[PDB]
Amino acid sequence: PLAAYEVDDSTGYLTSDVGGPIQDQTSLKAGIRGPTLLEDFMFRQKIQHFDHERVPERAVHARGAGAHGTFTSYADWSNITAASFLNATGKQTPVFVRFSTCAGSRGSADTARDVHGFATRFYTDEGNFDIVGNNIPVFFIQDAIQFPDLIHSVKPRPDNEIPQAATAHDSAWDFFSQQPSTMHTLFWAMSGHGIPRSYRHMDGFGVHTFRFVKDDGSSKLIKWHFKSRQGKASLVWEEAQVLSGKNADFHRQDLWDAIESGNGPEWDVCVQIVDESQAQAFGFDLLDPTKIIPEEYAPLTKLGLLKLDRNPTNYFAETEQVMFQPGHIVRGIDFTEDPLLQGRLFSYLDTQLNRNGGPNFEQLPINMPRVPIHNNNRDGAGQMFIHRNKYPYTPNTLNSGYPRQANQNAGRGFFTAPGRTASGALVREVSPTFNDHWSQPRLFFNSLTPVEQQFLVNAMRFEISLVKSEEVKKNVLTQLNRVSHDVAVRVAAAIGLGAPDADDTYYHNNKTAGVSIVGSGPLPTIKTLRVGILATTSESSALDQAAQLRTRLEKDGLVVTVVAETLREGVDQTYSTADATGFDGVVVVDGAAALFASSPLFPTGRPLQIFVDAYRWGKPVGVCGGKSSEVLDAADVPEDGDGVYSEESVDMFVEEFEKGLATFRFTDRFALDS
Amino acid sequence: SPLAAYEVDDSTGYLTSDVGGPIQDQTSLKAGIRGPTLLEDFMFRQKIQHFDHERVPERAVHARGAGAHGTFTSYADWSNITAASFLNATGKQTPVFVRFSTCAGSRGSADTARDVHGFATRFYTDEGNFDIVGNNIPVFFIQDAIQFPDLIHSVKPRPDNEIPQAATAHDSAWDFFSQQPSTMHTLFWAMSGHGIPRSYRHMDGFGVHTFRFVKDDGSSKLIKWHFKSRQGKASLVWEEAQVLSGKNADFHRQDLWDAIESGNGPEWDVCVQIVDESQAQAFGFDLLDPTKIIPEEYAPLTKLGLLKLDRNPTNYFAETEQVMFQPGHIVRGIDFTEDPLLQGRLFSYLDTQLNRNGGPNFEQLPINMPRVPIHNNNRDGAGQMFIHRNKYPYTPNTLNSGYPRQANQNAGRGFFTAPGRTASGALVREVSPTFNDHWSQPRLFFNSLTPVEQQFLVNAMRFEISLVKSEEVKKNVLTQLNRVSHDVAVRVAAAIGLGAPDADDTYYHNNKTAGVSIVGSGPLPTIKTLRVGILATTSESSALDQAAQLRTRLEKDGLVVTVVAETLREGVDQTYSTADATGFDGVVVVDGAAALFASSPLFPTGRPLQIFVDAYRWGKPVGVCGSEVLDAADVPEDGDGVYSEESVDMFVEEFEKGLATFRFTDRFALDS
Amino acid sequence: TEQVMFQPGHIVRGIDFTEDPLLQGRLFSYLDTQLNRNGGPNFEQLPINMPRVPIHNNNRDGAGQMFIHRNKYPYTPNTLNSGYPRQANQNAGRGFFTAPGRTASGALVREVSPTFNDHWSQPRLFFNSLTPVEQQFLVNAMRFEISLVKSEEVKKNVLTQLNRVSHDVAVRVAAAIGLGAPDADDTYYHNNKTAGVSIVGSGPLPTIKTLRVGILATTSESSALDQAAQLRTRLEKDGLVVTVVAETLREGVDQTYSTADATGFDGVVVVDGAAALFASSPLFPTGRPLQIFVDAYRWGKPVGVCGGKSSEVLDAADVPEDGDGVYSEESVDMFVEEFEKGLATFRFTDRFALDS
Numbered sequence A: 001p002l003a004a005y006e007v008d009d010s011t012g013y014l015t016s017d018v019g020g021p022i023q024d025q026t027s028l029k030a031g032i033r034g035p036t037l038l039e040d041f042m043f044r045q046k047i048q049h050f051d052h053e054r055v056p057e058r059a060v061h062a063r064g065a066g067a068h069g070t071f072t073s074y075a076d077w078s079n080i081t082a083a084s085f086l087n088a089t090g091k092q093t094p095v096f097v098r099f100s101t102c103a104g105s106r107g108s109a110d111t112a113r114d115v116h117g118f119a120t121r122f123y124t125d126e127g128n129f130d131i132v133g134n135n136i137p138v139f140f141i142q143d144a145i146q147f148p149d150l151i152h153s154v155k156p157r158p159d160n161e162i163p164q165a166a167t168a169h170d171s172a173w174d175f176f177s178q179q180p181s182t183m184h185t186l187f188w189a190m191s192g193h194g195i196p197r198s199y200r201h202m203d204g205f206g207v208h209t210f211r212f213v214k215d216d217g218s219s220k221l222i223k224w225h226f227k228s229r230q231g232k233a234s235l236v237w238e239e240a241q242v243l244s245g246k247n248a249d250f251h252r253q254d255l256w257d258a259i260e261s262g263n264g265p266e267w268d269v270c271v272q273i274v275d276e277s278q279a280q281a282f283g284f285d286l287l288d289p290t291k292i293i294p295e296e297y298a299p300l301t302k303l304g305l306l307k308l309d310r311n312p313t314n315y316f317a318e319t320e321q322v323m324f325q326p327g328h329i330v331r332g333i334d335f336t337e338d339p340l341l342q343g344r345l346f347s348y349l350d351t352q353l354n355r356n357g358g359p360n361f362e363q364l365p366i367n368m369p370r371v372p373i374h375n376n377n378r379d380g381a382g383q384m385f386i387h388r389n390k391y392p393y394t395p396n397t398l399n400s401g402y403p404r405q406a407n408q409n410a411g412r413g414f415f416t417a418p419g420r421t422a423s424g425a426l427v428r429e430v431s432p433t434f435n436d437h438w439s440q441p442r443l444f445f446n447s448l449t450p451v452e453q454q455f456l457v458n459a460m461r462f463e464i465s466l467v468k469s470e471e472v473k474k475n476v477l478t479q480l481n482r483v484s485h486d487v488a489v490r491v492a493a494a495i496g497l498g499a500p501d502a503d504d505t506y507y508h509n510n511k512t513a514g515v516s517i518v519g520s521g522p523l524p525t526i527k528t529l530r531v532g533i534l535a536t537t538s539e540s541s542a543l544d545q546a547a548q549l550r551t552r553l554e555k556d557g558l559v560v561t562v563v564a565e566t567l568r569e570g571v572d573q574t575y576s577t578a579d580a581t582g583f584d585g586v587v588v589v590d591g592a593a594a595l596f597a598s599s600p601l602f603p604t605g606r607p608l609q610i611f612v613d614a615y616r617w618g619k620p621v622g623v624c625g626g627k628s629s630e631v632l633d634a635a636d637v638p639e640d641g642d643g644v645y646s647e648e649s650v651d652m653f654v655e656e657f658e659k660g661l662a663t664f665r666f667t668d669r670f671a672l673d674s
Numbered sequence B: 001s002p003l004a005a006y007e008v009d010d011s012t013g014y015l016t017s018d019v020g021g022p023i024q025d026q027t028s029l030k031a032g033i034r035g036p037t038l039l040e041d042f043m044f045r046q047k048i049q050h051f052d053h054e055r056v057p058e059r060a061v062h063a064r065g066a067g068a069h070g071t072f073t074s075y076a077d078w079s080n081i082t083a084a085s086f087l088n089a090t091g092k093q094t095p096v097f098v099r100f101s102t103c104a105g106s107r108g109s110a111d112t113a114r115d116v117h118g119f120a121t122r123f124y125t126d127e128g129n130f131d132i133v134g135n136n137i138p139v140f141f142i143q144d145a146i147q148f149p150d151l152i153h154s155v156k157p158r159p160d161n162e163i164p165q166a167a168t169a170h171d172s173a174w175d176f177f178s179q180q181p182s183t184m185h186t187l188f189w190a191m192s193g194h195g196i197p198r199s200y201r202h203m204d205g206f207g208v209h210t211f212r213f214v215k216d217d218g219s220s221k222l223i224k225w226h227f228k229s230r231q232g233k234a235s236l237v238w239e240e241a242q243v244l245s246g247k248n249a250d251f252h253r254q255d256l257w258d259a260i261e262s263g264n265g266p267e268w269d270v271c272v273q274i275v276d277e278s279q280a281q282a283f284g285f286d287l288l289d290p291t292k293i294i295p296e297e298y299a300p301l302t303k304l305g306l307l308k309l310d311r312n313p314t315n316y317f318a319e320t321e322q323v324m325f326q327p328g329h330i331v332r333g334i335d336f337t338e339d340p341l342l343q344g345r346l347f348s349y350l351d352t353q354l355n356r357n358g359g360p361n362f363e364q365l366p367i368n369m370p371r372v373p374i375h376n377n378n379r380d381g382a383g384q385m386f387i388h389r390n391k392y393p394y395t396p397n398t399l400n401s402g403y404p405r406q407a408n409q410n411a412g413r414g415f416f417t418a419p420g421r422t423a424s425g426a427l428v429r430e431v432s433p434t435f436n437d438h439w440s441q442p443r444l445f446f447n448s449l450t451p452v453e454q455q456f457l458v459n460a461m462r463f464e465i466s467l468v469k470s471e472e473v474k475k476n477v478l479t480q481l482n483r484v485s486h487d488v489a490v491r492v493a494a495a496i497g498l499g500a501p502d503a504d505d506t507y508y509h510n511n512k513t514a515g516v517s518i519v520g521s522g523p524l525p526t527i528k529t530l531r532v533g534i535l536a537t538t539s540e541s542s543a544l545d546q547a548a549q550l551r552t553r554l555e556k557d558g559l560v561v562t563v564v565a566e567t568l569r570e571g572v573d574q575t576y577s578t579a580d581a582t583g584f585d586g587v588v589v590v591d592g593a594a595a596l597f598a599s600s601p602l603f604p605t606g607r608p609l610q611i612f613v614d615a616y617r618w619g620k621p622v623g624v625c626g627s628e629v630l631d632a633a634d635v636p637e638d639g640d641g642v643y644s645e646e647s648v649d650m651f652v653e654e655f656e657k658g659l660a661t662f663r664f665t666d667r668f669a670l671d672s
Numbered sequence C: 001t002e003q004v005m006f007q008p009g010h011i012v013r014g015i016d017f018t019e020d021p022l023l024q025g026r027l028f029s030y031l032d033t034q035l036n037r038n039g040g041p042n043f044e045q046l047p048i049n050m051p052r053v054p055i056h057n058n059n060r061d062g063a064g065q066m067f068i069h070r071n072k073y074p075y076t077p078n079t080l081n082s083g084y085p086r087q088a089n090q091n092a093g094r095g096f097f098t099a100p101g102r103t104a105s106g107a108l109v110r111e112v113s114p115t116f117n118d119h120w121s122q123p124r125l126f127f128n129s130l131t132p133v134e135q136q137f138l139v140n141a142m143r144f145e146i147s148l149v150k151s152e153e154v155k156k157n158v159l160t161q162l163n164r165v166s167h168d169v170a171v172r173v174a175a176a177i178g179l180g181a182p183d184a185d186d187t188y189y190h191n192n193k194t195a196g197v198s199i200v201g202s203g204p205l206p207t208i209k210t211l212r213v214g215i216l217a218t219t220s221e222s223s224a225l226d227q228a229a230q231l232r233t234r235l236e237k238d239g240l241v242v243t244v245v246a247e248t249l250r251e252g253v254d255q256t257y258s259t260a261d262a263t264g265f266d267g268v269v270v271v272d273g274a275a276a277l278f279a280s281s282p283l284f285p286t287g288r289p290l291q292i293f294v295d296a297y298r299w300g301k302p303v304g305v306c307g308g309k310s311s312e313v314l315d316a317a318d319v320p321e322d323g324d325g326v327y328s329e330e331s332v333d334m335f336v337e338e339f340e341k342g343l344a345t346f347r348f349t350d351r352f353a354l355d356s
């Protein structure tokens, strides 16, 4: 894919960057115990490179991971868009996708509670087209000019730089409560969408309304929705926290492993399509990025399949250096007057100068298009091209008038949708059509299941309880109360304040499909899900049981880890390094029961803690072999429990257990406010 | 002070651009109320351009870190051993800035990663800035600076997928260690409690290299810097460090910030070991070799002065992120040695600052400025903040009357290279054979730890090496560990189901040395700032009363008290939902709360009990104030560091003893 | 000087932009380009770029950040910093505001307004407003530059465009380059003139202070040095910058003939004690003293001989004694009074050939 740029070092002698064979292990010194010499160019070339390895992290979405893939169109979409990549059934275009958290620095944990990025580049035969989206369909703010306010508030306090990758501090909730537009995204982030099970188990959204533009000039309004084929799934908060410490790399490792095992994740790339006349028809403004179109109003149209199936060769060169822009647009697509989108168009082109340190960032391999470039851009630091045209100006006769101007009528040029207009005063004023900040947050809340609603309440209780300012806490209750009195009461109970009186201006009872995680039913596939088998080296029959279970589980593409006191043939991991956050279900072989009812080889009570944690976090758990009561009694897990299994037959154990893995979470183990 | 002049106050006033024009910054300028944004909106672009360019490259190593201001005070006139001005008078005060850090992780990684730690001190002296750029471990992994990128690439994440963050627990790191045996000494330190210190305040600082002290008369002696903590030595246990990394990635920087805010700024005695030049090879190793310590039994510590950190930064980015240390920031009275690791460092720091700052004028940032006049002919460069009056910036000149004047051993208090230093021999890329013993001092170190400490170290190695996928690498690791201690190799081999190689006694010995053991260093000299979690309940007026009684007592003794209950209210600090045992150094359950330890929508199932049990398993002082609680938690009433008293005052007294002991190590199983 | 970074975006309350598409795009360029020059986003902190009033905003960090900001809540809206900094606009805080009568209406277009389409009438207005000799200089600059263009097609295309401004210009230029001018095309021709664009027509200079007078003298005659000293005193009294030139330096001589050139002076005076130099030396190139005088005359400057004896110098130079801007007096006083009128006139344009 980027084969032309690969460098192989599987053989050969060390050389400088200019091909001179050298060594790099000992400095040149004036005598054997002498000082190092300035003339040692071997030393200086190697250390200079090392000294300059780092580049600025992205201003947001610093922490993330990418993979290569293919997009395949399901149809000829010419009848709605001139976009070349969508112009034929089965047409394939290479892609690169990067997923990320949003607030944390490089090296912060994947399983922070946060908005997540989902950025996709299509290397089309008419230019690179990027859709730079999030896993949440609405954004916090209604005007790009407010982005630094939002980001400053969410990022660590700037005196001490605390806390990392978290909204759980005063400044964030101060902003949220003073800028009520934030409520909708806030509710999404406080739901299980803020803590996805993996990048493969979340959807991607363009957020903004864009336009599809036909060759004839007619346009329609669209929203992009990348719908996961793996299904939707979340962690529970108290698992996400432990996982942040046990495996900061959880999401990037999950993605990397799925691709390597031939389970590359897939999404249906979809749009909602509506007429230009419907911009204000749905009870809100399609220019407002804090609003969704309910699927009951406009159904999803599937355009094609996105599949990620190839990991990068060098993370820095590919994932770190990929530079996405919403301004990377192609003929057939256009912008709308969404004031958040409008300002983004400026930001991405500008910020890449910061990251790259020079203007030629489009020439980096990962950023290059797959079709020829013909323009009069020249020079600049890091210029890799050697341009033959010595008359790089338009209009010219001395290069026969090339390159020629491309537009609607010639050379397949980009063109602005010709029906677009502007009218009015030049103003710094918010449209009153943007003013309802609360009805959609309530629509979202109403659409979650009872346990889902409790989890959202509990996320808010956790975070707001860490806000020191009594005034900020009260202000937060004021805003929450406008979305839902019941939310405000339940949150207030945790923080020892009174909720204010119900204000029903924005309350309503409407619901919408497709936003609940709990309500989206069992997972459509269990391939890649992780089963930890707790066993012991003290009983050769426990290992026999573990081996039989492994064979039967791996047959169905589950990723199996056998855990014992020490490593040996057939054991993957020791108890010392094992944790419940490492598994989607946990099985104990009854031969190992004694470990459950002290060792220098693992912390006290570790084998039982793995089982108890997994149970408490809602995972399918069980004992295989017939003798289950010693384990279940020690764990205080009821044998009759939903998602608790006990069979002597390995085949029968696995059949039941696999149903539990697809259910994924057993939500009856979590208490509800009365 | 350069920082006072550049402080910007925004507590009043209307918003302005960077050029002082009053503006707004909340709505974009548009062609009509639902129209597109205008290119002519300079308010928008100036604000967004700034935001777009806020980030700068992180440090190549020590990216995760935090800083504080303070003072250094000399104990004596040290002219008898050094010309250094900041050391030339009893009571002489010099401002300092210190930055502490982990070493391998990127700038958002957890404080409580297992790692070497940075301890970099700048003394803004009256003869120039002097930096001691040290670590919390006295020896380094490698013997030549040219190997640094090899070490660092191996320990940092694998470069195809950038996994794992802030961890040596992967194949490449152990491959490097097992192929480059000089690493063993530092590896042993990193695998001990020194890899997971309880806080920046509870670790020491070392200059690592041998340096020189140079007197005005030109004579020199060899020195090692040792900053000795007045807070005592303390570590986490590994399982606790893991949970902490998720619950509070900011634990160490918060611990430091808080200690300073409460008037408990941390202190170190700044010390040196001082030996004669003739002793460079007298101790059974080469003092140019940065993998060796001088045992304290061979050269005792001399206390030069007090280092105290007592003011937090105003802006983290401007001060902590932008501070740029250099071992080349040296002052008259100090010199380098021919340590090949030190030698190459001198080049690296000056060069790397170009990457971070993006221009050559990084010494003009307020945090990097000196507190004395600058007179030189350095000019221009991006970001030039001075307006130089001298229009003849060359030497020799007559047109500026020969100024600036040359400074040297005999003019203007100039820096001078120790005049006794020589070099002789071939120009070679060869390692001195005096550097070849990579295994005796790792053994010395291991011998000097207590039995439970040695077990913790074996268990750290068992943890990490079990995660290495390559059988070849694991075998090579056992080969090197075996040269240090056959017992260590046997015990770690046990966990990974390989057989250890046969004993090879070449480097074995039974020697020990003082001052390297954490557990063996006795109870903490102070318990001020240590954290007590009181587990209570809102359902009992008596429980809240009991909590409050304890609070007034413990707080008067300097302890930081957190009362935990189901919900916040008067006198309750944290909810059970946000509480964790990693948040405390000791845990107390009040009697009236006994019921919680037997379901609630206000916290996860079993949370109250879990905090108590985690605290006990991690060795902390735990207690009940007011038997069933100790029963539910399976905690022995007669256990060392388990407290049970009806008497408030009696409990606080016993418990405060427990906080000093800090860890009750009898709770951890040992190989036998 | 090198670090000053100007921007038309540096605007203040009371001024606003217009929809000139050239101006509109400049607003982007200057902010962006300073990143290239400065290498970092904090270029407004360079001393030459700093304002002379307080700065209150939430811009933060960036390479080279010189400020230490005390406000730890740099976001709007906030309560934790009491809502400061406050928003400034037309009604509060003397904020910048866009002229409120400004509007836009129409399609979003990449099209040129047809009102921009006349490219030729104003060039012709400008040309008409210059004096005859001025028009000759302009034709001569065009003849000079276009003659160096190698492509015959480009030269042809240039005459096509010039011909639309003025058939006469195209003809006169065409003559120098051996091509024929296109036939007259009078769409944009006219006879209108405008005030204030002509240099030659702007009358004599309002001041001669700082103008440069080179006095050519000799060390071979003590009398020449004396004349040069007296002239110097009389000229310096009026704020003129005087350079005395001779073969070698000594007290009262500023420059050698070797370094001197007519381009260094606004007027040139030979002292008659130095007349023999104007008829070889290892101390300057052959013919240098005379060449300074002749160049000065050819380039239209006031030139003269002071002392009373002028024919030897003037004849050697081929300069007519009665030409305008040519002076000859014995009296230093009378000489300077006449010469100073010539310095205000500045250029004697009757010395330049015109096309017929």
Ligand code: HEM
Pocket: A057, A058, A059, A060, A061, A064, A098, A099, A100, A116, A117, A118, A119, A132, A133, A134, A139, A143, A144, A145, A147, A206, A207, A208, A289, A322, A323, A324, A340, A341, A343, A344, A347, A348, A351, A352, A355, B048, B051, B052
């Ligand atoms: C709809 C709301 C938004 C979404 C879904 C969004 C999405 C993203 C994503 C996914 C990335 C990381 C791309 C990658 O993986 O490299 C990103 C980076 C960035 N975003 Fe946006 N963003 C939004 C709003 C904004 C706004 C309003 C601004 C500023 C006006 C902005 C400025 C940036 C900057 C400076 C970066 C770093 C870009 C780079 O270094 O390449 N974002 N955003």
Ligand code: HEM
Pocket: A047, A050, A051, B058, B059, B060, B061, B062, B065, B099, B100, B101, B117, B118, B119, B120, B133, B134, B135, B140, B144, B145, B146, B148, B207, B208, B209, B290, B323, B324, B325, B341, B344, B345, B348, B349, B352, B353, B356
């Ligand atoms: C004795 C062994 C060493 C110790 C104790 C040491 C200590 C440190 C410390 C404490 C910092 C961070 C200072 C801060 O807080 O900003 C640092 C940064 C750095 N070190 Fe060293 N180091 C050692 C060896 C080396 C070697 C051999 C090289 C390369 C030849 C090196 C290159 C760097 C670089 C490039 C940085 C980032 C510096 C900056 O960005 O300002 N280190 N090291």
Ligand SMILES: [Ca+2]
Pocket: A156, A157, A169, A170, A171, A172
């Ligand atoms: Ca805060």
Ligand SMILES: [Ca+2]
Pocket: A357, B358, C039
């Ligand atoms: Ca740069």
Ligand SMILES: [Ca+2]
Pocket: B158, B170, B171, B172, B173
């Ligand atoms: Ca590796």
